[PDB]
Amino acid sequence: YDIYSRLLRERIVCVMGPIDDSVASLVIAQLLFLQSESNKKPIHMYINSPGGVVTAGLAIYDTMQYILNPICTWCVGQAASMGSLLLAAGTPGMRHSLPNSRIMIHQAEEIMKLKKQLYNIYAKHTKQSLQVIESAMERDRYMSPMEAQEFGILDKVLV
Amino acid sequence: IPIVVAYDIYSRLLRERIVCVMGPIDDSVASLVIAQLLFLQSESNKKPIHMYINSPGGVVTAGLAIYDTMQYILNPICTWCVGQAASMGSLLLAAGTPGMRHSLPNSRIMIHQAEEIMKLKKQLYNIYAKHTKQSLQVIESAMERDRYMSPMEAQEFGILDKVLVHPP
Amino acid sequence: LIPIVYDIYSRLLRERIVCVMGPIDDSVASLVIAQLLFLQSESNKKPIHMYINSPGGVVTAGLAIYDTMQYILNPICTWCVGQAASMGSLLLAAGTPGMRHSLPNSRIMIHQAEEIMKLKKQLYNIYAKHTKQSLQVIESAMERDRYMSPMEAQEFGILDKVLVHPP
Amino acid sequence: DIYSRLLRERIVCVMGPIDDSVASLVIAQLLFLQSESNKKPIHMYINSPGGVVTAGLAIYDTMQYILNPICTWCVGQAASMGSLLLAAGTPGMRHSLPNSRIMIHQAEEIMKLKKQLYNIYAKHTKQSLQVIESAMERDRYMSPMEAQEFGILDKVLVHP
Amino acid sequence: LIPIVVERAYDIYSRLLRERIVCVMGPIDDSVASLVIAQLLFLQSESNKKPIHMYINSPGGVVTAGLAIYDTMQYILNPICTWCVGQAASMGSLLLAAGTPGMRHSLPNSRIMIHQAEEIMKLKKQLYNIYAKHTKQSLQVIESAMERDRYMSPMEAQEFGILDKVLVHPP
Amino acid sequence: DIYSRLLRERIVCVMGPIDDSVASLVIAQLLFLQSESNKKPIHMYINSPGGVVTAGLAIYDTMQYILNPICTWCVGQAASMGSLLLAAGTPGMRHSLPNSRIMIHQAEEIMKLKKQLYNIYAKHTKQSLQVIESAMERDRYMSPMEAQEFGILDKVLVHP
Amino acid sequence: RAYDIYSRLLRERIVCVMGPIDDSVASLVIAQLLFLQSESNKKPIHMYINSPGGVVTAGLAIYDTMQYILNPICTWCVGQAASMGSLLLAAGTPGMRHSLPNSRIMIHQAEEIMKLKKQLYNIYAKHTKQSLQVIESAMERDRYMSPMEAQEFGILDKVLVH
């Protein structure tokens, strides 16, 4: 057992380092395998992502929403734009984050269309309207997890 | 890369009859996927295979190689789209057992891609028509247009069979 | 990389399925000939399947594979997958007459000091021995650089049968 | 692996520059060892020229999350985030061998980022904010004996 | 990568060593010389009389590495069975001729060539003498023929004395 | 593996540069061998052109904390930090082969670190600090016989 | 392939020193040498040399280990032995330094270079029985010596013409 494999036995899936197509392949593979291992038990996902490809991160967001396990997401260190989506996509009520975490939401025409999809999915999961998020995506700033608990991304900031 | 107990994670999923086609379609990916399928079809003549696509494109002859073997295998084939199925990916996506080319709601799909390339394009046209039922000039118009499509819109063109907003 | 427990190619090798995929170089020539001589060691009458997907290759490595294929008594079924270009077509042609197959969309193509023109006569000669067409016929085919469909490969004798679904 | 045989005896070797890759290994060993037991401590060997700021924080809050006592041994150089991790050891159990060197030194999020480091240093070293603010600004490696009066180490060890 | 056929599982090359087959394939190097020399020493320890088959496909290589292989080939008391496949050019031709007489072989379709710091001369003068010993040709025929740059058919090499049989089937 | 076969026999090979990477392994191997036996000798073989000072200092620190007698064998050259390791063998069992090549030669912070090097040589070579000053200034490798009179070695052996 | 047949060759006490002598090769060679002495203090060791020389301070580390050991060392030059590699060839036990019929041998390779040059001369002089004057003159010359020239020089004892 590699420690990553030992962790996977306890249904802990890491996402750390920039989300590329290869990390997505491993994360999707583990998730599908963890679903077939159990259609009931939770899965824990640890997010430390400085960034990610939009179509890669969208594939993981799809897979998480279209899987029947409860997904608990933990912010360790930083969840940049693509990671903040994946954090906010964990099952509502079970999105934890560590005290000194850093969250950032901010990121031709097809890119605007996909960016429009991101606006819509962020509005659903954080339960803000479209216009609130339209401004909050525009501001290129990190935020502390206490502000993110109020903004609606996190549920409980864990110390 | 994770291990599971000693199978690699992919080696475990291959037991669940799942073929991961990700990344560019190249000779190695085709060689590996063709070989995977030959094995899986030797384990059963009837059990549906699941092929999961996230691919930006690839070599035209490589995608045709997987397409050919997909036709020759007797098993049913679920073809799922996670992320994107561009260029040759859309042919592999279209090539599943008609009626069960499933997909995931936020995917993005793109059919768009001397005389060898021209004659070869007239082959892609015919095979898209057989799976998507469309007419040849319609395909040539759509293929000529370079813009992503949605899984709702993809199902209206016929490439996808069912978007799943969740497991049913 | 490769699905392992005893990767898939060792697993395919066990059923006498010998891949030649990617270009034919001396490195792959060394491996392919070794597999053949092993498979002849375990059983001599039984079939061997060779799957060819090659864009081309170094002429002297393919020739090494070619006369190795001739040397063994096994019937060698060749399967053309995506490409049999240049030497791949010659390796495809080397199968036991009747058993050189293609998938319905593969592209087959035979176009390629003093030794190179002498090497080409050998290529002329060896294509002719396997395709039964005349010598000037083969010199006319390879002078023009074009890919040709599997239906045409049947009439030229390179294939014997294109298989959409098994009989 | 001599490294994996040191994991059986509850030793985590944070050596080399701190990066997200080093962070993934380190936090994973820590979470595993807590699952093994909640009583026996974790021995942490720090030797790091430098570190990604958010990586070192990810170790620290993982450090402070676990119920284990964490024995922190500096060997060689514990610098920048390595000094946060060196301070991050449980109070009463921060060690060094006598030849080591230590350095605390290191867009509004950068300002808030540097600010949150001040608070954590103040919590564990118990020095006031102005003391730590000036000290981090001083680009100077400190000797362990200076670090010990500054409070970062409980014990400097000569021939234990 | 190499197909791992199971038996403990051997590489396909390790399987062929069991059958006493040494694959000298690719450009001859100091590393290939070490690999090939070690295999030959192990094979004599394996059997003091049973033959050793050497498959040669070498575009050439460093002469001082080729000679190191050839020297052990001469030293080893077992019969050696040198098969040309593909090509045996420059130093690979010397090993092709280094097998026991009447047992050096060539596939019907191989291409063979004997054409290749003043040691370059004294060593080249060495190569002529070893070619003279093994091909049974005189020194002058070798001197003039080695300067000709041209691959030779297996029939021409047969009549030169390098190889003893070109066949189509094992019989 | 051959190197781990030597570890079974209590041999630790500092072969090549003393870099952060190799210091981590040698420290780890040393801690292991202290646990295997609390009394049996530990043998060290040195062939080092040099390395980074802070990593060599981490090796020296551990060698001093390990209780056991450390036999330092010079095999090849011991340049810069390797000679400090060689001089840090427990007195009475610092050895070298006849044809070995030995070399002690090497901002404010480098000065401070280099002032540390002086004393650690001084207390092990039994030389006055001004003497270490002059003999650490000259860029010249010295024979094992010359090193014995300076104070680095104890025996220059030709056969055991 | 490379490193398990050599593990087999370690079994019958053959140490392959091939490729340029670098400290990694030198450190592995001495590690094998001490290990083989640890197996038996009296049995022979076979050394196979094909090296286009290498780094002098590590070749002296190899050379010093060879004079250290109790087991007799037999050096078999194959191919070419150059520079520092020729020092290993000379340093086998007198009476056990051999070569193939057509190997090639060469003895040619700050104050440290000058001092290193002097001590190499003593080693060659001790094991080859020449005068230091002969070694100076013979070490300047760049030429490779034939095996028969090397036997008469005294570097080697016997050539395996048989």
UniProtKB/Swiss-Prot annotation, chain C:
DNA-binding among keywords: no
GO molecular function list: ATP-dependent peptidase activity; ATPase binding; endopeptidase activity; identical protein binding; peptidase activity; serine-type endopeptidase activity
Principal cellular location given in the protein's record: mitochondrion
Record text on subunit structure and interactions: Fourteen CLPP subunits assemble into 2 heptameric rings which stack back to back to give a disk-like structure with a central cavity. Component of the ClpXP complex formed by the assembly of two CLPP heptameric rings with two CLPX hexameric rings, giving rise to a symmetrical structure with two central CLPP rings flanked by a CLPX ring at either end of the complex.
EC annotation from Swiss-Prot or TrEMBL: 3.4.21.92
Active-site residues from the entry: S86 (nucleophile), H111
Record carries keyword Mitochondrion: yes
Cited function: Protease component of the ClpXP complex that cleaves peptides and various proteins in an ATP-dependent process. Has low peptidase activity in the absence of CLPX. The ClpXP complex can degrade CSN1S1, CSN2 and CSN3, as well as synthetic peptides (in vitro) and may be responsible for a fairly general and central housekeeping function rather than for the degradation of specific substrates. Cleaves PINK1 in the mitochondrion.
Name this polypeptide is given: ATP-dependent Clp protease proteolytic subunit, mitochondrial
Full protein: residues contained: 58 to 249 of 277
Swiss-Prot/TrEMBL keywords: Acetylation, Deafness, Disease variant, Hydrolase, Mitochondrion, Protease, Serine protease, Transit peptide
